[model samples]
Each structure stands twice: as structure tokens, then as C-alpha cells.
Target chain A: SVQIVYKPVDLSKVTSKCGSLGNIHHKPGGGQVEVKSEKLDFKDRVQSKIGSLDNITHVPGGGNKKIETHKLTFR
Target chain B: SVQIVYKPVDLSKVTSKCGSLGNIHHKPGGGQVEVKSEKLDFKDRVQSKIGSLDNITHVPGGGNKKIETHKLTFR
Candidate 1:
């Protein structure tokens, strides 16, 4: 299992305002993004090893998988 | 072993220009970034399994490793 951590961007300075007429206070919220990859089990590991070995007589086919893109935005 | 393939960004449209005086021809080059993570050997796998097991008598210590951030840029 692999994990990727993305830190949130700070927009405090951009949000703060200094007005000549009056003073305005601005509050900003921030959060982080966490992504984890699927874990490979014992059977998957064994199958991978078998596929790598050239001496193996039988080759496993058609168990491929694809992971789609995950779009995450902080709003 | 895990591989991450980064596709090159298209900058052809930005580089091409249509001037009022004349037409300018621009040729832009693009490339991709490829990053490969270090492979976990059999010994490392065994150590990880042993660490997860509660019945292990002797716990292995002090084989920790860190991978520094790889700064990659396409120029």
C-alpha cells in the first residue's frame, strides 16, 4: 500500500484587505488531500512472480485492471 | 517496481504567433518525465511481514531508509 499526501495552499494574504474607509476581516479555510493506492495481496504477488518467470509453462492472461483519474479540488 | 509516466505538455499553440506585420514560424520542442521507484527485494518483504506478525520473538530494528524528493523539470 502506498500513500500520497498533498498539503493545502495558503491564501491568507490574498484574502486579507486593508481599506481606507474601514477595516475588513477575512477568514480562510484550508485542507489537505490524501490518496492511497490499492494493496496487492499474497495471491497477486504470487501471480506476478509466476508471470515474471520464463520457465513457467502456462501464462496467465486477462486479469488486467485500470485505475481512473481522481479529480479533487478545494473549494 | 512502480513506474510513473508523465506526458509532455503541449505548448505549440502558445508558441505560434500571427503578427500584424508578417507571419512568424515557431518550432516548439516537448519531452516527458519518467520516474521509477526503487524495488522492494525479498529480504525487505520478509522483514515487513515479520514486523507485522505479533508472534515473532525478536523484532528487527534500525534498517530504516528514506527517499528524498526528486525535483524534475522539463526545460
Candidate 2:
């Protein structure tokens, strides 16, 4: 699976068929960590990718999928 | 025309049929100003509206139309 990392300025704009805000978690002292599922993931979906200051990956979709943020690597 | 004001943190995320980034202008030392055209405007086109911390009207679309930022009034 292709994994990515990013800091979202506005969570509302960061949407995926993959999951909802309930699937997003904060980074303790900093930003948030969101996971994407293998089904129709961010890169897989055909649309204009949102802009970000960082080169973080788009979180995949989810079906209550549990992910460890520390295990992620940004693209 | 239904004019509105808003402070945009990123112009890239603010997409609208009303206009493009080339049509946006930033305030002297603050945020940015974007205009919308009455034709197939932001409100008219049905889609999920982008989120903003402050309630601001989406900039209208344009065809090289010049708008004065001072003239806007935010919703």
C-alpha cells in the first residue's frame, strides 16, 4: 500500500471516500494523523488533489481501520 | 450582486467556477480578495462548500473582471 503524510490546514476540506473526520487523530503536541483505506484511496480517486504546504501523503479511506501514526512516513 | 468578504489562508483550496487564482488579489499586509462572476457562480453550482474558520462568501467567478477588494462585504 502506498502511504503518505500531510498537515491539514482545514480538516473540513480534507475529504476522502475513504473516511470521515471521526477517523482523524491529533499528533499530541502538534497536528493530526488520518489514515486511508485500500479501497479507492486518495491517489486512486480521480480528482484534483488538494494543496498543502507540506509534501505529506493523502490519508487513505477507512472502515474503522486502526493505524499507528508513528509508523507512517511522509512523501 | 450578493457580495461577501472572507480571509483565505490558501488560495489553492478555494476553487470556484466564479474565477481563478490569477483573478485573486491580496490585501496590502493581510489576506486576499477574489471575485465571482454572476455566470454559473459559486453558489449556483452544486457542490460541497469548502470550510472557513470565519463565515466568508466564496469569491465569484470572472472573465478578467477587475474588482476592488475594499468594495467587498463578508457574509
Candidate 3:
């Protein structure tokens, strides 16, 4: 029972850079293997979310920040 | 608008090392601010979960890998 997928990359979008959290493993005797985690932290301020699905925030410039996703399970 | 809390540290427990992904903000004019994201990947082979609340796996040696906590929200 193995399943993984973590693709996070943000190489500075004007000073909000935080990358390195790569992983994508789904090999139960098949294919797909890309495990690499840890490394993330940076904030220059960039977001535009005021809760649309539950309670969300960040409205500094309120111009960007619209990408919701949920599906994580590790074993 | 701020909220902070991110505490993750793993210095090789036999193998497997993935760190960095700090973030915690809950300040709407109050306190709590620790934003840092990205950085994670490593697999020396470790994990022991065959689904409890859901579906989990990894039982090689399976003598370690017991620490569960979920509550992540970013904006």
C-alpha cells in the first residue's frame, strides 16, 4: 500500500518564494516513483483569499490566491 | 491577518530525512505568525500504517512511524 504525490513549487512570484516538497510515489509493483520532501518557507506577502470555502484569509493586495485542493493521505 | 504554527524536525531516524515547511498564521490584528512553506522529500524506507481512519500502508520493519496530526490551512 503506497501512494504519494507532492508537487509544490513557487520560485519567487515577486518575493513569495517557497519550493522543495517534491514527491510522487504510486508503485505497488507498477511505476511512478518520485519521493522528496522537506524544505519550504518564505513570504514577501502575496495573496487574495477571504474565505470562499470555509474560513480563509489574506487580503493584503487581494489580487491573487485562488487555487484550492485537498487530497492527502500518507502511510 | 496572521496565524502561525509549524514544528517539524527529523534528523535521520535510521534513514529518511525531509524537513522545512514552516507556516502558522492567525493574526487578524492579534498574534500568531509563522509562515514558511516548501521543502520535503526523503525515503530511506520507513512507515507503518495500514489504514486506521482511512487507508495507509508501509510495514517494512514497521516498528516506528507513529505520529498523526492533521490541520493545515493556507491562504
Identify the candidate with maximal TM-score: 3
Per-residue lDDT tens digits for candidate 3, residues A8-73, read 332322112223332322212122222232572334433322111222332221122223344443
TM-score-best of 2 and 3: 3
For each candidate in turn, the interface RMSD (Å) is: 29.8, 28.9, 29.8
Worst lDDT 10-window in candidate 1 chain A? A50-59
Model 2 chain B: lowest-lDDT 10 consecutive positions: B11-20
Clashing pairs in 1: none
Best by DockQ: 3
lDDT, residue A75, model 3: 32
Model 3 sits at an interface RMSD, in angstroms, of 29.8
TM-score of chain A of each: 0.17, 0.15, 0.17
Displacement of residue A41 (Cα, Å) in model 2 is 29
Candidates ranked by lDDT: 3, 2, 1
lDDT tens digits, residue span B1-75, model 2: 432223433322222131112222222112322223232323222322211222222322221222222232223
Q: Point out the higher-scoring one by lDDT: 1 or 2.
A: 2
Model 1 agreement with the true structure over B3-73: per-residue lDDT tens digits = 33543332221111111211212211112222232432332232111111111111111112222233433
